[PDB]
Amino acid sequence: SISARNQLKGKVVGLKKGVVTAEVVLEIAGGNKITSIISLDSVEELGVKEGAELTAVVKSTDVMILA
């Protein structure tokens, strides 16, 4: 459990591993998708796998707002 303001729970629906990074796609409430690129080491350490229930976290200063 953490205090971060932006926490979106979802289910992993896609995982593509590279050499240094990995792309994780999560389906969140309503069904919308969140895509994350993290280190491959983290995928392994956190045991990220298709179907896993995980949470996407984003610092507020990284959220752009467009029309």
Q: Which is nearer to Cl ion, 1 or 61 (CB)?
A: 61
CB–CB of 5/56 below 8 Å?
Answer: no
Nearest distance from C-beta of residue 27 to Cl ion, angstroms: 17
CB–CB of 56/39 below 8 Å?
Answer: no
Does 1 bind Cl ion (CB under 5 A)? Our answer is: no
Encoded tokens for 4: 């971060």
Return the range that interacts with Mg ion (CB under 5 A); candidates 28-36, 38-46, 48-56, 59-67: 59-67
Detail the DSSP E strand segments found in 5-62: 7-17, 21-28, 33-39, 53-57
Kindly list the residues in this chain that would bind a second copy in the complex (CB under 8 A): 1-8, 16-24, 26, 28-39, 41-43, 45-48, 52, 54-67
